[model samples]
Target chain A: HMRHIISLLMENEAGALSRVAGLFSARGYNIESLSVAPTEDPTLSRMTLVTNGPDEIVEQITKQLNKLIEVVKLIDLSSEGYVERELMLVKVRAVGKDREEMKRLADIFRGNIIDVTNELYTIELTGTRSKLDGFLQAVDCNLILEIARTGVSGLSRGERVLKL
Target chain B: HMRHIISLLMENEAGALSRVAGLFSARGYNIESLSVAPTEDPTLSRMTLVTNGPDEIVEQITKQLNKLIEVVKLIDLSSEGYVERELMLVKVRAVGKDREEMKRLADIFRGNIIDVTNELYTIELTGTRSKLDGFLQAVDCNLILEIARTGVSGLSRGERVLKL
Candidate 1:
């Protein structure tokens, strides 16, 4: 499946997220990852979702999203040049030789060792989703303890922007 | 009056996010910011939400959240020592001297200028929610053209893990 970054501008209210998610599921679309937060204007919120589909299915996703009354604007960031990023907090087993390897990998990826215990090291890294997966691939599967990702957030590159 | 980072581990499915969000709104709880993404285990999704309330209200938030069938586990990262991070993409009008100042501020805040044009620059930053807020505060509000934040995602400090 081809990945896409979908951005939406909506009213900041109690039912916004539910309504958005409801529409997506109702249309048979599943969000791979989602993020939402209030905008500079507190009355509005912007949401970014990572999803993918075929040609007709992708059009349907946008059509269904705009059907919501609260949705003011929608942009498929993947259709244009944009900057996409995901933040990951990963816990890895760091004992003996693993410690040095892990530290080296974190530095190579420009990640910060946010927290550490004798047995585990928690690293925080930010990049596109693919970069994150690349880092995970470099780590031993057995060493991964837990991970929390903030999904994918995107904005159009250069002068193009989705804003009120 | 107090802020909170509410984390949840729930089933990864089409209606999972909708169900959790519906429960929150049904209880009259408005989430300040929220993010949800699949975990390493494809069968589960992790959601992190930022909210605010007094002591009694927070307890009610937890009680209400647990009532959702989709919620397998939940944690209030608010009271503990945890690692919290948020991702922000902000666009600022970098005209004249503002361009020099904005670049300096981005460096000072350790933000990456992901995209730049003659009149604008978009910076990507990842840090605790408060740190993100601080970066915004330092910038000239009028120069901020657009902003998107990936809410807050957190993990327990050190070896403490919130997992099934």
Candidate 2:
């Protein structure tokens, strides 16, 4: 499967999100992961969408998105010269003998202890995608309760803006 | 209009996001802001949604959401005690005389200068929603270029999860 991560900058307005989603649905494209938030200027927002498809289809999607009045910029993160990162907060359930073990494991991963109840310890972890996946695998399923993540937000490695 | 901030804990899976969005659309609810990220566990993600609706309608939405198979937990952040924060990265075109002024302004706001070019300065700021709004307003528009934000993600202040 060919994976592409596309980041779009757009005007922050009602129905903008629906329009983007509708575009994908109309084309039968499957969005793997999509995240959106307002930009510093209340009038704009940045949306990061990850999906998979043929090269021709991806290129067409990009072209169509750029033509939209609200879309300001779009970048392909999977292309060369890009940097990406994600943030996550996970609640790991541990008890008795596993408590110390879980704490030690978290320390090794440099995860912060954000919350602790009698039976659960929540840790905050931020890093590249692989590091997060490794941490999740290390903890396994038995002690895991909940997880929250900021999908993937990235910028070009060098100082440059998307060509208009 | 009454605004409600909803926090949801849900299983991570393909199409889970679309389902959530579809639910809102089916009911004619308008989402002002929405963010979803992986929580500490690989199997789950936390979704934060801010929307405006009548009190009764909000209650109905929450009840319906909780009944979904993937939903683990849900809470209204506007309801009493919760600590909410959002993160933003802003790139501004600060050149010539505006350079020094921009630096001083960022220092006053406790923003971090992550990238600096002869013609631009990229700053990172994290804070509550109102604080972010104030920072953006203070920066003015002539020099602003781009902005990216991580929407509101929060937990209750105390060490207790919302009771089921």
Candidate 3:
């Protein structure tokens, strides 16, 4: 299955988001992750969502999305010439020797130890979704206690912009 | 209206997110920003959403959310003692001395210039949502060409943990 990251600009109003999410659910399509926020312009909000399916499904999804009145613009960030990123916050057991290895792994990933306690360390890391998965793979699975992910957020590179 | 950050832990299912988003929209409540992704536990996903409303509305929203069968847990991150972070990737006009000034501003914010071209610079930044707003406020607004924000991703500090 092909993975896609879609960026959406929409009216920052109540029910606008619900109508959008409901579209996917009604079709039995699953969203891998999603992020939405107001743009520099407070009246509008930007949404980035990840989903997986075949080419036909993606095509249909795009066409269906444009029909939504609240949606202002939609772009497939997975398309060529785009930058993709996701944020992850993890809580893991880091004590004694385990703490040393955790810190070393985090340092290599350029992750920050945002919160720390005698028994656990909360690290923040941002990168492509795969890079974050790689970080988890490199660490001892037992050490990880919890994780919070910020889906996928991205922008097209260069002069092509999603604007009014 | 004051802003509030609401965090949620819910079932990882096709309709779970839609149901949550629907709750707010049905009540004519607006969501300023939102992010949701799976946790280490494959059965669940974590969500962080920002909204603007009065105290009564916020309380009603919570009660309504708790009524959803898929919602396992919910937290208002604005209540304090939590680590709240937002990620942003911004493409800005960068030419001649303007590039140098932009670089300086990014440095002050500890933002990384992740992608660069003679015509633009794409900076990667992570901080509180307000801190990100501060970064934009400090820069020449005209220079901002594009922005992709990860809304907000957060967890409680210390011993508090949102677990399944």
Model 1 agreement with the true structure over A1-164: per-residue lDDT tens digits:
67778899998766678888887677667778999998887788989998756757777868977888888899988888888899999989999989899999999999999998888899999998889999988987888888899898888888787874
Chain A TM-scores, all candidates?
0.93, 0.90, 0.95
Which regions of candidate 3 are displaced past 4 Å? none
Q: lDDT by residue for model 3 over A1-164, one digit each (tens)?
A: 78888898889775677777777777887788999887777788888989877877777878888988888889887675988788999989888998888999899998999999988899999899889999988987787777889998798887778884
Model 3, position B104: C-alpha lDDT score: 96
Any residue pairs clashing in model 1, and if so which?
A: none
Q: Where does candidate 1 chain B have its weakest 10-residue lDDT segment?
A: B155-164
TM-score of model 3 vs. true structure = 0.96
Report the C-alpha lDDT of model 1 over B1-164, residue by residue, as the tens digit: 78888988988888788877787788777689898888878888888988877878888878988887888899898778899899999999998999999999999999999998899999999888778999988998899888889989889887767784
* lDDT (Cα) of model 2: 0.71
Can you tell me the CAPRI class of model 1?
medium
The best-first sequence of candidates by lDDT reads: 1, 3, 2
List the lowest-lDDT window of 10 residues for candidate 2 chain A.
A155-164
Give the DockQ of candidate 1: 0.78
Q: Relative to the unseen true structure, what is the Cα RMSD of model 3? A: 1.4
- Please tell me which predicted candidate would have the highest DockQ against the true structure: 1
Candidate 3 chain A least-lDDT 10 residues: A13-22
